[PDB]
Amino acid sequence: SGAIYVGNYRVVNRHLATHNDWANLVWEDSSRDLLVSSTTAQGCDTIARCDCQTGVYYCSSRRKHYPVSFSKPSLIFVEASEYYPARYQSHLMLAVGHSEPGDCGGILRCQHGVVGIVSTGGNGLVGFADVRDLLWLDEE
Numbered sequence: 508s509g510a511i512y513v514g515n516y517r518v519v520n521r522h523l524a525t526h527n528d529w530a531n532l533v534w535e536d537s538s539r540d541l542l543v544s545s546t547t548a549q550g551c552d553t554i555a556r557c558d559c560q561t562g563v564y565y566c567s568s569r570r571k572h573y574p575v576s577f578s579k580p581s582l583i584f585v586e587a588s589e590y591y592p593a594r595y596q597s598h599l600m601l602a603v604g605h606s607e608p609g610d611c612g613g614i615l616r617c618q619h620g621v622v623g624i625v626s627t628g629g630n631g632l633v634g635f636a637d638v639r640d641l642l643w644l645d646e647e
């Protein structure tokens with residue numbers, strides 16, 4: 508589990524969105540595994556605006572933050588998980604690291620701020636849904 512809180516936006520894995528998220532929907536994209544809902548209170552997070560390929564992510568299944576190198580966001584085939592069938596997921600970054608389903612929502616951060624959230628795992632990789640292209644998160 509986990510979210511990004513930027514301005515009056517809450518960014519979650521689409522597959523973990525709650526009824527309240529869907530009732531306060533700003534934007535969602537199944538292909539990206541992302542959903543954004545509106546918040547009443549302002550959030551503590553700053554979104555990275557950059558093309559970093561190194562950062563640190565939180566792994567809940569290890570209670571640990573790991574430094575990683577990661578691929579640039581791309582359209583990637585993802586094997587079946589407990590929460591999606593095998594499918595193509597867009598805007599996904601991969602790193603070598605540990606990820607189980609419940610690790611989804613852990614933050615990946617670089618020197619510029621929040622890069623994305625854990626969205627995939629298995630076979631020794633961790634996949635992160637990028638948010639750095641979502642410029643509208645920073646305004647309005």
Ligand SMILES: O=C1CC=C(OC(F)F)C=N1
Nearest residue numbers: 587588589590591592593
């Ligand atoms: O292997 C699967 C097939 C379908 C899924 O989607 C949904 F049923 F959770 C999840 N895992």
Ligand SMILES: [Zn+2]
Nearest residue numbers: 557559617619
């Ligand atoms: Zn960066």
